[PDB]
Amino acid sequence: GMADLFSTVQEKVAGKDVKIVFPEGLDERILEAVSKLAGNKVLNPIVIGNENEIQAKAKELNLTLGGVKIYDPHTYEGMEDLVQAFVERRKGKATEEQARKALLDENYFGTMLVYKGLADGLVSGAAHSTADTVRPALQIIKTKEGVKKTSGVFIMARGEEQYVFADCAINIAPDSQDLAEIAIESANTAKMFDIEPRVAMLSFSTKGSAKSDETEKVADAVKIAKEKAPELTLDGEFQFDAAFVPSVAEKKAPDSEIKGDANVFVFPSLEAGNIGYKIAQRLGNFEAVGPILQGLNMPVNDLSRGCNAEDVYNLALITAAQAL
Template structure:
């Protein structure tokens, strides 16, 4: 267990945060739920058909004693959630449509979070990112001042912790969206014990190249500094100028960042997704996430290739986001 997760466990203490795991019949999810239940720090809520859930647990020799599980269609408050869903969607769904939609575990689980019956949700072991994110955007929605959610990764190697964003959601962010991603990424960093120093990345450093793409990043830096003047943030930077002190001294000697950035905002999803996977696979960093940013309550997405350990770790992160 890395220091980060020991830190999260200490932060969570005995607050009893409840995390919904909609994919209750997946053996990886069951394994993680049993681990969470045994530790007693986070309370897992499994969703699924009773017979299927119990059979999956039995097949994997997993003890469900003490773990809360819910069959959505059998929940005593199912009709109450239907009415709440219709109200939240403001005429975009009828009662009949809502009844069908809430039979979906991700939609039902998101409604548990929205209604205060749970503190967060982790899904994606058997569902696409869209299946996890769409209900969150429709029901929980983004915070005031945030136009879109974004996906960050905590990149860890030894004692080093970095934040990379957006690596999961927004394909071609505008300058305004890049600024919002920068501020939300700084908040994510703080939540995990990282004092944020934010670099807005490009293929140019401080005007070494000029194009529509670089100018978008330059504008994003201006917007972000207006939104949070106290945040240590600068750009546009090539990665080496943001990360390597010797390069920073040559390319951007007057910047507040001296090659000591630890939060990196990529100019596009293409760059961010490729970048984090290169660092993960070639650099040997552990990639934790994606952590969805900017929502009113935490919902996080797993990779379908995840392990039980990934489910466990993201559950702790999600619980910590709700503090």
């Protein structure tokens, strides 16, 4: 179901020697995933932490660290160069002593590595707050060309059915400019899973039903998006009905690009987005793939604390894909 969706991603990744950093080097979820990722030669994992400590941990887990490189921030050669690169990136917001201290942190150390090409993407989260990962991601690595913010999408899958849900994790109260962006970026992220983008901007009314600030926010969001990205198939201010079921599409709003065949649903607020994917998961019995960030210069992703060893493996597959 969701599983063959990953085999499609692993297809694209495997054999390209993509390097992904895993800052939580002592976490068995990461060690197991890393150990196996290297074993099958899918990608080249880099782990951060004390080499002896990790080596011994891997052993009590009956693991081996085959094609796995280990970097210790208290040993790395290029630290001084990294320290210097960081201060330059922080534009004076960081002294040298600050930089040095900052980079002794797993997540920061690993983010700098991805920033300076020593790694292609980072994957942390199994033992940190979601902020502790996205923070450096935004201070060091930044958002792409015309992107101002990151968003968290979720791949929803149930059998043949595959959808993308727009920012159900990062941005709390997105505005018109934000939504339009969430929609454009989510549409591109869906390309990575070989989905043909058909965006629908959700709200509690369809193209006019109710007229309040909240509906106009999204309506405006559609203008912005359509203007900024003409070719992308997306119409806006739909209720889930109109966006998901065709009968309702021609009734509530015909003449619209979307004909009840939306496969990318942009939610109006984090409250809708979060409760949304969760209701779809627990009630609709859809498989839900955890937050996937988007719009950054280099791939960075947040695993769920208390996640799964296979969850670590797949995020890596997705993160590597974003890099390719």
